[PDB]
Design a protein around this ligand. Structure first.
Ligand SMILES: COCn1cc(-c2cc(-c3cnn(C(F)F)c3)cc([C@@H](C)NC(=O)c3cc(OCCN(C)C)ccc3C)c2)cn1
Ligand SMILES: [Cl-]
Ligand SMILES: [Cl-]
Ligand SMILES: [Cl-]
Ligand SMILES: [Cl-]
Ligand SMILES: [Zn+2]
Ligand SMILES: [Zn+2]
Ligand SMILES: [Zn+2]
Ligand SMILES: [Zn+2]
Ligand SMILES: [Zn+2]
Length: 312
């Protein structure tokens, strides 16, 4: 008989006694240790006082699991530990003061998302996400990347889209204060004003230029004719302008960071462009400096606080 620790959040810990003759699965159910599944493994002398992750089997563990991860999905813990076993072996080099990822298992889109998150203001609602967010900013980004995969229902090696990944993450962050007021003007129907909140207030698909969104874009109307949609007010710490990959010029100082995508749809590669004192390009562990940039951009991130249009 050996005393061990079981947990669902590595915060609230529970002291259980274990027996050598029975595997961990017979006594606790699905059980993990640093990514390894010890469900089929019998306890060893080394497995003493160590902390084990277990699937929630009682109400205390079920409540603690939601308090930390904000999900009751029974597959979350398994999909999380399955990704963690990969992300712990990845390399996270410091590139231009930012934490990146050495390329492995098509993680280009994860590295681009991780680099973007270090440059925009965001507060995650699940304590698991926020804690790993902080640890990732310090350099230990293995747990954070595994959580991103779990929350996005993506597996290691699967090909991912940065805009879709950011969208999933935004829905797990506090964006209630974020407001976007738009106005569409039709020559026949008239003018109509709509107010967006939360994730819809920080993302737009159609154009890469925040300026063009302020000038107005052509959107078809209910009557069938092309109308003009322009930004009236914007109260958010940032905005994300997305468009299908097209050739675009990035000017130093006019944007925070951007996503470059080359290759065929769903099978291609992602690079990260950020606007420090000069334009930097981060391709995983690689770094190149240039004063100008023209290439296939699909996401552009801009800083914002409060904006009210001057058009009437
Ligand atoms: C030779 O071809 C070149 N080509 C490339 C493109 C192109 C067009 C768009 C786009 C998005 N929106 N639009 C719009 F039409 F709406 C279009 C987006 C991309 C890039 C960013 N993302 C992916 O390619 C991608 C998508 C993924 O999942 C999508 C499925 N979702 C679960 C729904 C998963 C992984 C990756 C890498 C590329 C078009 N032509
Ligand atoms: Cl929730
Ligand atoms: Cl949430
Ligand atoms: Cl900006
Ligand atoms: Cl398409
Ligand atoms: Zn939540
Ligand atoms: Zn691996
Ligand atoms: Zn791997
Ligand atoms: Zn109309
Ligand atoms: Zn790649």
């Amino acid at each position: 008989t050996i005393k061990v620790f079981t947990t669902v959040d590595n915060i609230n810990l529970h002291t259980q006694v274990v027996d050598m003759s029975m595997t961990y699965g017979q006594q606790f159910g699905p059980t993990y240790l640093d990514g390894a599944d010890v469900t089929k493994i019998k306890p060893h002398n080394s497995h003493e006082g160590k902390t084990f992750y277990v699937l929630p089997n009682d109400d205390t563990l079920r409540v603690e699991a939601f308090e930390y991860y904000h999900t009751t999905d029974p597959s979350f813990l398994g999909r999380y530990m399955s990704a963690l076993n990969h992300t712990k072996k990845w390399k996270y080099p410091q590139v231009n003061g930012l934490t990146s990822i050495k390329w492995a298992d098509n993680n280009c889109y994860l590295a681009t998302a991780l680099l973007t998150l270090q440059q925009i203001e965001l507060k995650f609602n699940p304590p698991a996400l926020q804690d790993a967010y902080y640890r990732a900013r310090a350099g230990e980004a293995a747990n954070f990347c595994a959580l991103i995969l779990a929350y996005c229902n993506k597996t290691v090696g699967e090909l991912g889209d940065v805009r879709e990944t950011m969208s999933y993450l935004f829905q797990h962050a506090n964006l209630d204060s974020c407001k976007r007021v738009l106005n569409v003007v039709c020559k026949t129907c008239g003018q109509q004003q709509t107010t967006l909140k939360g994730v819809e207030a920080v993302m737009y698909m159609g154009t890469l230029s925040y300026e063009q969104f302020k000038k107005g874009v052509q959107i078809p109307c209910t009557c069938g004719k092309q109308a003009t949609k322009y930004l009236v007010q914007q109260e958010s710490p940032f905005v994300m302008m997305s468009a299908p990959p097209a050739q675009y010029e990035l000017k130093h100082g006019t944007f925070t960071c951007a996503s470059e995508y080359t290759g065929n749809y769903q099978c291609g590669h992602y690079k990260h462009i950020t606007s420090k004192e000069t334009l930097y390009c981060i391709d995983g562990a690689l770094l190149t400096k240039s004063s100008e940039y023209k290439g296939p951009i699909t996401d552009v991130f801009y800083k914002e606080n409060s904006y009210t249009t001057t058009i009437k």
